Amino acid sequence: MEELNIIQGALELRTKTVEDVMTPLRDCFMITGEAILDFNTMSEIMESGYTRIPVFEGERSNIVDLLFVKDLAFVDPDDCTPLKTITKFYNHPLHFVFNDTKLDAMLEEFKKGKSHLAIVQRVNNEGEGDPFYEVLGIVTLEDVIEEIIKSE
Amino acid sequence: MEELNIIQGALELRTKTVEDVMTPLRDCFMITGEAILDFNTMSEIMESGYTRIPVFEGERSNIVDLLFVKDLAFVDPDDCTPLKTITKFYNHPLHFVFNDTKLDAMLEEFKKGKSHLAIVQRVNNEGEGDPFYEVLGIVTLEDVIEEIIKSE
Ligand SMILES: Nc1ncnc2c1ncn2[C@@H]1O[C@H](COP(=O)(O)OP(=O)(O)OP(=O)(O)O)[C@@H](O)[C@H]1O
Ligand SMILES: Nc1ncnc2c1ncn2[C@@H]1O[C@H](COP(=O)(O)OP(=O)(O)OP(=O)(O)O)[C@@H](O)[C@H]1O
Ligand SMILES: [Mg+2]
Ligand SMILES: [Mg+2]
């Protein structure tokens, strides 16, 4: 039954964390902030199929912004507009989350806000002296939902 | 509690039908097949935030195609390409579903396919002689998901 798998997933929201279902950084379709929204760039982004594209600068672990396909609506390819212009203008808020975060809580924060995408990062206390925040990947509402509705 | 909301939705997956959670035709963002994809049309489609756009011809009930935002990737607004060109090119399959269809069966049909959008239609028996199919609206995976996870 579908109901059994759904209920089981709901139960498992208590146990599992965001790291269990996240899309790790190496599997994330991202883009540099130094990009130029000419026709080719826009077509790449659009055929990627992803609604939300994390924007990094320098290194992929350095997520500095978040691009929506929706933002490309009024963008003319002929103008060759720098992406920095769009990310500065819209300035969609970035949402972060620790790796040990349980799925029920993540579902709660997703529900409560307009947020659908959080950035999974880990507290790197295994120094190398002083610690820092280490971006592991991304987690979306669809991940949680799929963990709910998947068969098992 | 969230677990209980989810379990309850699971319990309601067989009681409720797709008609109960569909987005009715009058609330659907749609587009004519006679449309030309100039800059204004593409910007209007992109601005709407909808990934999948029902393509109607004649009346809005006559859903003949399904447009994907993804299908606008390689389209240049300067060409003023007929939308018919793109719909004929990709030809995304149309999925129809009867209004009395339960949410569990709908969910099962969604999972075992790439399809995420069905057209909710019923059988208008008040003849007027020969019966026919009347398009009521659209239903997506997101709809049944929202049914599952929402509070009650
Ligand atoms: N930029 C990205 N690169 C790689 N994977 C992504 C990206 N954005 C989302 N995903 C992954 O896609 C899966 C489904 O996510 P989601 O459906 O929210 O993305 P989407 O299809 O762009 O959004 P929507 O479902 O609203 O269209 C998730 O597992 C998520 O990790
Ligand atoms: N073309 C459309 N016009 C109006 N409402 C729509 C349309 N497509 C979907 N919806 C509604 O929006 C809600 C969410 O649907 P869904 O999230 O699948 O659309 P989407 O966000 O464009 O797709 P995705 O989430 O995969 O990016 C559903 O309740 C559905 O009924
Ligand atoms: Mg998706
Ligand atoms: Mg959506």
From Swiss-Prot, chains A, B:
Residues 22-83, 90-152 form the CBS domain. It comes from the Eukaryota. Induction: By low Mg(2+) concentration. Coiled coil: none annotated. Widely expressed, with highest levels in kidney, lung, spleen and testis. In the kidney, predominantly expressed in the distal convoluted tubule and, at lower levels, in the connecting tubule (at protein level). It is found in: Cell membrane. The N-terminus is cleaved within the endoplasmic reticulum. The signal peptidase complex seems to be involved in the processing, but the exact cleavage site has not been identified. Signal peptide: none annotated. Changing residue 99 to A: No effect on N-glycosylation. Belongs to the ACDP family. Isoform 1 and isoform 2 may interact with each other. Shares weak sequence similarity with the cyclin family, hence its name. However, it has no cyclin-like function in vivo. Divalent metal cation transporter. Mediates transport of divalent metal cations in an order of Mg(2+) > Co(2+) > Mn(2+) > Sr(2+) > Ba(2+) > Cu(2+) > Fe(2+). This is Metal transporter CNNM2. The gene is Cnnm2.
